[PDB]
Structure 1
């Protein structure tokens, strides 16, 4: 076909047409073999092919991926038939081989229909009745493994897979397939409300993770209590809200920044607390000498002052109990030295 594309000048003159009609049967047989190979490749189903895997990697949902893949296969088949029509000329179907080839192509195209899967997907979407309306976030009861009590794990009233439906609808609109207007409205609402919901869920996950990190080290929870108090107050303010409102964006923004500040203060307190605990443990076994004790105490007080200037929460009792522990350790070292 490329060789012919090099030379198409006197095809109007029925002199070179004898040569092309001499090999016309070879052309038809080879094109038939090509379309048979393409159909064999098609017979490998979309989920059974790596095309579905890559499209999932390419953010293309499997339903739309299969639909568009069949569409492009049909487009390539149409390109093949129109190119054969162009190269051979008008009325190749008049030949018995030509009409047989066109019948095979039409049968394959009938087997290559695509709207049925679109209708099935739309029917399934309508039947399941996807929705996000309700509460801003949901609280549930779960008995997590390892603990006898019923943990009231906090979740977000938002299905992560709804955006997949929204992107499916977005793809289908330019694909020429029309979905019911209710589905259009639902997908549009989910798409526009997605950033707020994902921000909410990431913020709540981060706050949870850091609060379990805090309670992992019980020596820090008393200091961190105030920040947890404001976080709980913000959660209490936000939970009463219905899923959709006009104050959603400012509330999500302030909650996210509050959670980020809470987490960063948590990690700063954690590192300074491990530092001070390490210094205390070193002083526990420190050799009997007024000097080294004095520098250790000076560094301890410097860390305490660094915490104080940061304007953290609930310091004085923490300082008092640190003094209690350090005076007990001092008494132990003093009895050792005295004996």
Structure 2
């Protein structure tokens, strides 16, 4: 069976494959590594059978050695690609955070494209994979953070509808979500002004459903850009416009 298969490793490291998934009419394209698990099983069988007196043919042992040469890069590529796929799935789970991972996903896709042109025989594989792995890990970590704090923001939003009508509670809740937005800014998430002004409209709508409100300071977009000489009016500093957002 092994001689019939005649497995080997060559060519480009990445491949694009079709996979039919129930519920979607279109065939899902996926990025697989050019290293099939059957080669790993072949190497495992070759190295396990040797000590039982089972004389394996020399060509199969040579091919197992060739596969084992590149196995350290292949396993890292496999796990990096799987982590990228799970990161994409996590992003797809929540559609309210897609714009906040534009740069990270773009650079990861750029690295993936750079690696598609790469081949096993090239000498760029050794650093690149490590770089790719690091990038993917950072992406995952970012997305992980981008999930948790965002959920907290949502929780705080849903806590403001039922928030007690007293200035101290409103002030500390808006301070908490402002600190959350500042933390978003610190970790360099793209399109923060878009997401935060959307949150500003949403919380202004909530306050419209709800002087105490008008004295509440607004949620600043980027509280860290200091020294750039720009001014914000009282309307942009507080929810003075909440009087204009009544539903009744």
TM-score (structure 2 length as normaliser): 0.78
CA contact (8 A) 1:139 1:153 kept: yes
Report the 3-state secondary structure (helix = DSSP H, G, I; strand = E; otherwise coil) of the residue aligned with 2:29.
coil
Deviation at 1:290, TM superposition (A): 2.9
From the superposition, tell whether residues 159 and 137 of structure 1 become closer, same or farther in structure 2 (CA, over 3 Å): same
In 2, Cα distance between the equivalents of 1:215 and 1:172? 45
Pair 1:313-2:190 in alignment: yes
TM-score (structure 1 length as normaliser): 0.58
What's the Cα RMSD here?
4.7
The counterpart of 2:159, out of the listed 282, 303, 312, is: 282
Q: Deviations over 1:78-127 (max 9, x none)?
A: xxxxxxxxxxxxxxxxxxxxxxxxxxxxxxxxxxxxxxxxxxxxxx3222
Q: Deviations over 1:25-48 (max 9, x none)?
A: xxxxxxxxxxxxxxxxxxxxxxxx
Deviation at 1:179, TM superposition (A): 4.2
Corresponding pairs, count: 213
CA contact (8 A) 1:226 1:314 kept: no
From the superposition, tell whether residues 270 and 180 of structure 1 become closer, same or farther in structure 2 (CA, over 3 Å): same
Structure 2: which 5+ residue stretches go unaligned? 211-224, 228-248
From the superposition, tell whether residues 162 and 290 of structure 1 become closer, same or farther in structure 2 (CA, over 3 Å): same
In 1, Cα distance between the equivalents of 2:54 and 2:122? 32
Deviation at 1:336, TM superposition (A): 38
Matches within 5 A, 1:258-337: 258-333=135-210
In 2, Cα distance between the equivalents of 1:171 and 1:305? 55
Q: Which has the larger radius of gyration?
A: 1
In 1, Cα distance between the equivalents of 2:107 and 2:144? 17
From the superposition, tell whether residues 151 and 303 of structure 1 become closer, same or farther in structure 2 (CA, over 3 Å): same
In 2, Cα distance between the equivalents of 1:299 and 1:167? 54
Deviation at 1:177, TM superposition (A): 5.2
Deviation at 1:313, TM superposition (A): 2.2
Report the 3-state secondary structure (helix = DSSP H, G, I; strand = E; otherwise coil) of the residue aligned with 1:152.
strand
Would you tell me which structure has more helix in proportion to its own residues?
1
Structure 1: which 5+ residue stretches go unaligned? 1-123
Q: Deviations over 1:176-216 (max 9, x none)?
A: 55544432321111011112111111111111112111111
Deviation at 1:161, TM superposition (A): 2.2
- Indicate the structure whose relative CO is greater, using CA pairs within 8 Å and at least 6 residues apart: 2
Aligned counterpart, 1:158 = 35
Report the 3-state secondary structure (helix = DSSP H, G, I; strand = E; otherwise coil) of the residue aligned with 1:135.
coil
Would you tell me which structure has more strand in proportion to its own residues?
2
From the superposition, tell whether residues 133 and 307 of structure 1 become closer, same or farther in structure 2 (CA, over 3 Å): same
Deviation at 1:232, TM superposition (A): 0.5
